[PDB]
Structure 1
Amino acid sequence: MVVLAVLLPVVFGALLLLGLPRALGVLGAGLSFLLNLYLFLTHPGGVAHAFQAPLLPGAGVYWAFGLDGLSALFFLTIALTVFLGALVARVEGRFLGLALLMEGLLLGLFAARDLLVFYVFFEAALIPALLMLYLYGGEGRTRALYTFVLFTLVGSLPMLAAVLGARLLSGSPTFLLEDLLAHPLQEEAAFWVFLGFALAFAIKTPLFPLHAWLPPFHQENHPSGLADALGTLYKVGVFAFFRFAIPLAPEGFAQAQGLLLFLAALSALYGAWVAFAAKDFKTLLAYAGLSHMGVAALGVFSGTPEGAMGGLYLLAASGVYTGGLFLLAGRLYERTGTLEIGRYRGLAQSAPGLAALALILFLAMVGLPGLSGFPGEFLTLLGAYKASPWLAALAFLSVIASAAYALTAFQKTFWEEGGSGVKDLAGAEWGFALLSVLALLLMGVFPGYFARGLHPLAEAFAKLLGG
């Protein structure tokens, strides 16, 4: 059942940290991958395997779990990405444990069927992230850490008032999501609570003015970018919005919608555009992530089930291809020793199939049809265009800037005249590669099958904004 799939990477990570050796946590992430996939296939529906247990009975906090049409793949996606992180890896700190921990944590995050437990996981995921940051490398480790951590925390602590306000002002008996939705908040109560959800959710999305933490985080982790790959699976803001923020207090979102769509747009454009100027992989992938999130959020904010489904989908898959690009970047680090874009040009003749792998990944990134990005990007386009067309448009001078940065990077890294020559592919990197390509191709070619669970949620919570 659900809780097992939730817990599996968590235990394996501990067994990696204190435990020996490094190798086992790899198949740990693999096992998580397989089970999460197993729950993905055989799903009955919204309930799946339901879980309820007392936590603070008197407070009204209970352990509440299950797989939605949403929670779903996100187990598969996260399990996957983190698995690649485990295998291809090479951080191998014995903090691949810190990674498996972080994976499991995120799994618990998506499965939360009640608000306060969700809150709990939401705050908990911070620690390995800061650790695999801090003690697992970087010179500017401590300041980047205070940046990432304090942004998240300053965002977070006030939300507890809203999560209290959501329960307390609505007179909801418990923190159970069902219950909370069953008692809607009124005008200028739902306002404040939605706002309090909206700050913590916006800063973790990220949207335009609040993204300033993202480039420093990804730079200073262990260069393979296991910590980074898991950091991107931590970008969960959109999911939190659609699942929690909007449905618990939609009346406020009705007011905020214009601004949110705008910010999503400007995040997308600015993100892809600024990404161009980036001189290193960490920064580049950061701004790119910002653009994608812009798109997703744009999709969600429009109402319009089309756009929303596009947003959540784009999120799910971009976790995978972004995390993949991170691990890949680290793997070329270990063989070279540098994350710089300009130096060490020749690769493509020197590297037999990497050009193909990295290319596949980047194609998935720019949102080319047949790969994971396009379905989400497109459906998003549709919905964004439905609510505010202009913001869909501004947001969609994205594809231009996106192809720009992605192709510039790919060319200057791979295509040109020979250097010394490079190591071909690692045995971990092969599993990484093939599995990656499989994921990207399958989510790209059959956007129907994945995201079918997204479809009921999409239109229902869109009509939630209706009469």
Structure 2
Amino acid sequence: MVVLAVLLPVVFGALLLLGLPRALGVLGAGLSFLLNLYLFLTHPGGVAHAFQAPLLPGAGVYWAFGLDGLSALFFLTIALTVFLGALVARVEGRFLGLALLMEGLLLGLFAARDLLVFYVFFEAALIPALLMLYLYGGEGRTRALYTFVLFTLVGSLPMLAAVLGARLLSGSPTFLLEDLLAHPLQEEAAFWVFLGFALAFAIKTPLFPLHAWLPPFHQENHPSGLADALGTLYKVGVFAFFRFAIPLAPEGFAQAQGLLLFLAALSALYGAWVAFAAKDFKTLLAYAGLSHMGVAALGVFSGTPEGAMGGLYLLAASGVYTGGLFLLAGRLYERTGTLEIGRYRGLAQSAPGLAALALILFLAMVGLPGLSGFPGEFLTLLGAYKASPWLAALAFLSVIASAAYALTAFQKTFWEEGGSGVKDLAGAEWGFALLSVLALLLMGVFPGYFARGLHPLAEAFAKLLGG
């Protein structure tokens, strides 16, 4: 059941960390992928594989798991992304085990059906990221680590008082999301609880003032960027907002909605814009991820089941293709020796299919119709225009700068006059490219099939913002 798929990446990452060899972690990530896909298929509903086990009888904490329509596809998304990061990595430092561990942790996080277990996994995911950051690369590693970690922790620790208030002040017997939603909070207490939720959920989104950790995190990881991909999969802020924060304390979100929509708009614009000014792949992708998270947050904050489903879908798919771009940058580093955008321009003629792969990925990033980004982007546009048309329009001065920075980077890396010549492709990179393009094309052409579980959750939690 669910717990088996949740735990499989954890045990495989352990067997890569202590045990040998590196190669087994690739097929371990593949098995996680297959089981998560099997759970994604034949999925009856949220309860699909319900799991309830005693953890803290006296305190009221139980292991609560199950695949929603949200949990199912997020399982599949993370399994796939980490499987790519396992096969193509070329890090092979024996911290691919750390990567698989973080995968299993993210799976449990999404499978969390109770607030305290959700919180526990949210805080636990910090350790692998910090390690694969610290000991496997980076010179400003220690300071980037302190920045990212201290930001996450200062945001998170008050959210423990927020969840304690959400359970106690509502008279909820346990931390189960079912019970917590069955006991809603009143005005000027749900206010403080939603504020305590929104601090952590915005700093982990990230939004405009709180994104200052994202470039330092992305730069100083292992140059292959497996740690960077897994950190981009760690941007669950939108999922937490939609699932827990707003449904648990909508009264505060009612006042904060204008501010949140505005922040999301400015984040999207600022990220897509500064990404142009970015001179390196890590910073560029950091600001790109900031812009995408801004759009997703806008979609969720608009209410508007359209915008909400758009935000969630955009979140999953942006995690996917951003991790792919990270692994691609890491492989080009392993073969060349630099992450600079200006140098080594001749790539297009020397690289037969890396040009086409990076182009596919950047097009999926800039939100081109037919690829994964556009469905979520358009639903978010609709919902944001519904909620605040002005903020929707401001947020969507983003496609321009997106296409700008993406085409600029692609051209100056590949198209121009031939240099020395570059290695063509690795055998693992071949499967990486094929599967990445396959997933991107499927999620772009059939956003109907996927997110079918997302539509009921979106419309229900958007109508929750009504009377």
TM over 0.5: yes
Residue by residue, what CA displacement relative to the aligned partner does 1:12-62 show, whole Å, maximum 9, x if unpaired? 000000110000011111111111111111100111100101100100000
Please list the CA deviations of residues 403-441 of structure 1 after superposition, one character each: whole Å capped at 9, or x if unmatched.
000000000001011111011010110110000000000
Partners of 1:336 and 1:424 lie apart in 2 by 11
2:93 aligned with 1:93, yes or no?
Answer: yes
Distance 2:395 2:453 in 1: 26
CA distance in 1, matches of 2:133, 2:165: 34
Deviations 1:102-134 (A, max 9, x none): 011000000000000000000000000000000
C-alpha distance in 2, partners of 1:331/1:15? 24
CA drift at 1:200? 0.5
Distance 1:329 1:138 in 2: 16
Secondary structure, counterpart of 2:63 in structure 1: strand
C-alpha deviation, 1:69, in angstroms = 0.6
Cα displacement (A) at 1:262: 0.2
**2:213 counterpart of 1:213:** yes
Cα deviation digits, residues 278-313 of structure 1 (max 9, x gap): 000000000000000010000000001000000000
CA distance, structure 1, for counterparts of residue 372 and residue 177 of structure 2 = 30
Supply the distance in 2 between the matched residues of 1:350 and 1:64 (Cα, whole angstroms): 52
Looking at structure 2, the residues matched to 450 and 364 of structure 1 have their Cα atoms a distance apart, in angstroms, of: 17
Q: Distance in 2 between matches of 1:169 and 1:240?
A: 20
What are the superposed Cα offsets for residues 316-357 of structure 1, whole Å, 9 maximum, x if unpaired?
Answer: 001100000000000000000111000111000000111000
Mapped to 2, the partners of 1:281 and 1:275 lie a distance apart of 9
Determine the C-alpha separation between the residues in 2 that align with 1:75 and 1:253: 28
- Partners of 1:99 and 1:13 in 2: how far apart? 7
Q: Percent identity?
A: 100
2:105 — aligned with what? 105
* TM-score normalised by the chain length of structure 2: 1.00
CA displacement 1:233-264 (0-9 Å, x = unmatched):
00110000000000000011001000000000
Alignment correspondent of 2:146:
146
Q: Distance between the aligned counterparts of 1:386 and 1:454, measured in 2? A: 19
Q: CA RMSD in A?
A: 0.5
- Match of 2:422, SS state, is coil
| Inter-partner Cα distance in structure 2 for 1:147 and 1:109 | 23
* 3-state SS, counterpart of residue 55 of structure 1: strand
Partners in 2 of 1:123 and 1:189 — Cα distance? 24
Which residue in 2 is equivalent to 1:344? 344
User: SS at 1:349's partner residue?
Assistant: helix
Give me the whole-angstrom Cα distance separating, in 2, the residues matched to 1:210 and 1:229.
19
Matched residue SS, 1:16 = helix
Q: Distance in 1 between matches of 2:449 and 2:388?
A: 29
Residues in 1 aligned to 2:271 and 2:212: alpha-carbon distance in whole angstroms: 11
**CA separation in 2, counterparts of 1:264 and 1:290?**
9
SS at match of 1:20: coil
- Partner residue of 1:47? 47
- How far apart, CA to CA, are the structure 2 residues paired with 1:214 and 1:365? 18
d(CA) in 2 for partners of 1:252, 1:69:
27
SS in 2 for 1:54: strand
SS at match of 2:444: helix
The aligned residue for residue 297 of structure 1 is: 297
* Structure 1 ranges of 4+ moved more than 3 A: none
TM-score by length of 1: 1.00
Which residue of structure 1 lines up, in the alignment, with residue 177 of structure 2? Answer: 177
Alignment gaps of 5+ in structure 1: none
Shift of 1:10: 0.5
- Matched with 1:409 is 409
Q: In 2, Cα distance between the equivalents of 1:389 and 1:323?
A: 32
**SS of aligned partner of 1:425:** coil
**TM-superposition CA deviations, 1:381-400 (whole Å, max 9, x none):** 00000000000000000000
2:321 is the counterpart of 1:321? yes
Query: 1:309, 1:320 → 2: CA distance?
Result: 17
Cα deviations by residue, 1:202-237 (Å, 9 ceiling, x for unpaired) = 000000010000000011111110111111100110
Q: Partner of 1:348: helix, strand, or coil?
A: helix
Determine the structure 2 residue equivalent to 1:80: 80
* 1:115-154 superposed matches below 5 A: 115-154=115-154
Structure 2 Cα separation of the partners of residues 284 and 33 of structure 1: 29
Cα shift readout 1:158-195 (whole Å, capped 9, x = no counterpart): 10001100001001000000000000000000000000
- Output one character per residue of 1:357-399: Cα deviation in whole Å (capped at 9) or x when no partner: 0000000000000000000000000000000000000000000
